């Protein structure tokens, strides 16, 4: 599926909410997202705040000391995949000292492609025992989910349908214990049939195409994926980038011209985190590896005869 | 009379206050493994 918004770079949002609106048009964050150290924020600051366009983060999501934030369900309602290309100490998701967080509420999060979860020291945090992480990560043995309100027997996590004597949510088994899975009082955890494997399924439970990841609008169609297992190319999920495209940032196919435009934007002002991009082994990358120098006329890494300049 | 983990954050929050923290070895080495003075610690505040 062709993304409605932009591909934004990695961000680090601190102190006040002003800079957070820089995310308003992102579909994909190509980097990490850190939101931290907001000491004077209150719940009223988050009552009217939402980023429904965000579907995917290529690296990691880190939330630390954000006061007044009680749930993420309105902030990141559609975040489906955290690829974990780069991680924070082996974690793709970090929720630490979030003093007011009552629930995660990331009800669309289907897959964490690489890395683990660290949810630690969140004194009001519940709706943790209700999440089956085995449906989201392969490596759940490296999860570190401790020192939350959830540790004791004061949460009482109540899932959709309970009041009506119903079990609206799918129930799964984690080491001999059978339990109904949900994110909040009003959102179930989506669980797909076993036949779907990691590909996801539509709202009706029909398997997505093998090139999808987590969710799709229509079954068995690689142009109808919410996110891709391997690479993305002009609203289509593909196993590898075909020629004349190059593999970029481990998730998308780009053309020579794109790689070239990046290279020639990074001319003057070496600041703000820029590299002169190069082509090496069908990838568009920040710099040539050691032992190679960049042939100037075609951005192509060539090995150096003797030491590199 | 060193500062670690929670105590360190609380101290930075008090010292920095409204200014916030700056961005773009570290503090643990300077202030937790070793003792640091207020002039070192305040260098972590935004302008």
């Amino acid at each position: 599926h062709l993304y409605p918004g932009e591909v934004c770079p990695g961000m680090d949002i601190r102190n006040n909410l002003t800079r957070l609106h820089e995310l308003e048009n992102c579909s994909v964050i190509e980097g990490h997202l850190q939101i931290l150290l907001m000491f004077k924020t209150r719940p009223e600051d988050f009552r009217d705040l939402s980023f429904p366009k965000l579907i995917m983060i290529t690296d990691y999501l880190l939330l630390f000391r954000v006061y007044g934030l009680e749930s993420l369900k309105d902030l990141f309602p559609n975040l489906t995949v955290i690829r974990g290309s780069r991680l924070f100490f082996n974690y793709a998701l970090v929720i630490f000292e979030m003093v007011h967080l009552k629930e995660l509420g990331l009800y669309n999060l289907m897959n964490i492609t690489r890395g683990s979860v660290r949810i630690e020291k969140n004194n009001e945090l519940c709706y943790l025992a209700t999440i089956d992480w085995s449906r989201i990560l392969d490596s759940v043995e490296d999860n570190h989910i401790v020192l939350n309100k959830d540790d004791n027997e004061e949460c009482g996590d109540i899932c959709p349908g309970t009041a009506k004597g119903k079990t609206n949510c799918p129930a799964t088994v984690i080491n001999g214990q059978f339990v109904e899975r949900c994110w909040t009082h009003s959102h179930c955890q989506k669980v797909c049939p076993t036949i779907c494997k990691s590909h996801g399924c539509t709202a009706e439970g029909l398997c997505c195409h093998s090139e999808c990841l987590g969710n799709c609008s229509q079954p068995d169609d690689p142009t109808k994926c919410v996110a891709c297992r391997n690479f993305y190319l002009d609203g289509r999920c593909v196993e590898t980038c075909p020629p004349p495209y190059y593999h970029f940032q481990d998730w998308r196919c780009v053309n020579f011209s794109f790689c070239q435009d990046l290279h020639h934007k990074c001319k003057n002002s070496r600041r703000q985190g820029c590299h002169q991009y190069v082509i090496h082994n069908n990838k568009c990358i920040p710099e040539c590896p050691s032992g190679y120098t960049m042939n100037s006329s075609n951005l192509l890494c060539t090995p150096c005869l003797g030491p590199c300049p | 009379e060193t500062l670690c983990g929670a105590e360190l954050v609380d101290a930075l929050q008090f010292v920095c206050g409204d200014r916030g923290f700056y961005f773009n070895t570290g503090i643990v080495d300077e202030c937790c493994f070793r003792s640091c003075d207020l002039r070192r610690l305040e260098m972590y505040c935004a302008p």
Binding site: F64, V94, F96 | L8, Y22, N24, I27, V28, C32, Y44
Partner: peptide
Amino acid sequence: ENFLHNSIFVPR
């Protein structure tokens, strides 16, 4: 945690 503080807290 110390790895967290080192990464997030930067002077300059």
